């Protein structure tokens, strides 16, 4: 859905690197591990947040209400 704010585990600001984490896939053909490396969350406590978030808001918003 929306990638949330402030990790339950650590609590730093999360989601700055979110669409960045996207574009380190398509136009770079870049593996996710080194992508998270150069992304730069040296803990894992935040790394899991983006590793298991699933977007839903796209499927939400591609209705046409009103």
């Amino acid at each position: 859905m929306i990638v949330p704010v402030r990790c339950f585990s650590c609590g730093k600001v999360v989601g700055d690197k979110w669409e960045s984490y996207l574009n380190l896939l398509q136009e770079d053909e870049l593996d996710e591990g080194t992508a998270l490396s150069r992304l730069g969350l040296k803990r894992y406590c935040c790394r899991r947040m983006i590793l298991t978030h699933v977007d839903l808001i796209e499927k939400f918003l591609r209705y046409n209400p009103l």
């Binding site: 402030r6 609590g11 730093k12 989601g15 979110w18 209705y63």
Partner: protein, 262 residues
């Protein structure tokens, strides 16, 4: 002079250092006040003028509540509980306005820099939204397309971390002492070997190995700490260290003066 202190590595956002000739209770209390009583400012009360999105309104509120703000001059303003006024005077709070519009054919984003300062800032550097990326975007809020409107009146008052994590600046901590088990406060689990079934500390090199055969040092005591504190960035890290020290000392002075009043 007593508690000598030595730095290891500094940045904009995380500080790791050495604390020596101190006591375990002192360090633990430092950690607790560090995560608990550092006053700041954040958005607390929200006024939804009109919502249209595919999200809920209090949903948007709790989403808003975690956006940190500029926190330098936070001492200047006053708590609403102690303030003599009612309903958020300029001395005790700030005002936030957010505007979005469904303009494009494609989907639209809202970044946390789109919110603006509203009321009298009175020159104290307060309440700007933090940007961290290369592209000036405070972290995402909600997504819209072509038809939806949000008008947000928001009021931000003081708050502290101990009653809600909204006002927490810390959001990380690190803590180490006796990396090499010399104080022997605890053994290790093992199935065949204590050594190989565990990895070394990263703090290994600053204290010598335990000499391998000398008798158990009994009259030793805890010292030589390793503190790495990584703040959120709503307020600088040196400032949060010194201000945690400040609020601890003011608390202890308050209890002392209450005692001498009694």
């Amino acid at each position: 002079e007593g508690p000598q202190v030595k730095i290891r590595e500094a940045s904009k956002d995380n500080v790791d250092f050495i604390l020596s000739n101190v006591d375990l209770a002192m360090a633990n209390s430092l950690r607790r006040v560090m995560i608990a009583e550092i006053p700041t400012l954040a958005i607390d009360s929200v006024e939804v003028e009109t919502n249209t999105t595919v999200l809920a309104d209090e949903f948007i509120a709790h989403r808003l509540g975690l956006i940190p703000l500029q926190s330098m001059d936070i001492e200047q303003l006053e708590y609403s509980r102690d303030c003599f006024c009612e309903d958020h005077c300029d001395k005790c709070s700030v005002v936030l306005t957010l505007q979005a519009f469904g303009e494009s054919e494609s989907t639209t984003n809202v970044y946390s820099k789109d919110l603006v300062i509203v009321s009298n800032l009175m020159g104290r550097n307060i309440g700007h939204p933090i940007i961290q990326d290369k592209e000036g975007n405070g972290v995402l809020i909600c997504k819209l397309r072509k038809g939806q409107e949000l008008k947000l009146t928001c009021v931000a008052k003081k708050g502290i971390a101990k009653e809600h994590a909204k006002w927490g600046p810390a959001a990380a901590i690190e803590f180490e002492y006796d990396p090499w088990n010399k104080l022997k406060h605890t053994d290790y689990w093992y199935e065949q070997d204590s050594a190989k079934e565990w990895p070394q500390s990263k703090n290994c090199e600053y204290e010598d190995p335990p000499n391998e055969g000398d008798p158990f040092d009994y009259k030793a005591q805890a010292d030589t700490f390793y503190m790495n504190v990584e703040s959120v960035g709503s307020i600088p890290v040196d400032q949060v260290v010194v201000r945690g020290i400040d609020t601890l000392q003011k608390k202890v002075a308050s209890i002392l003066l209450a005692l001498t009043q009694m």
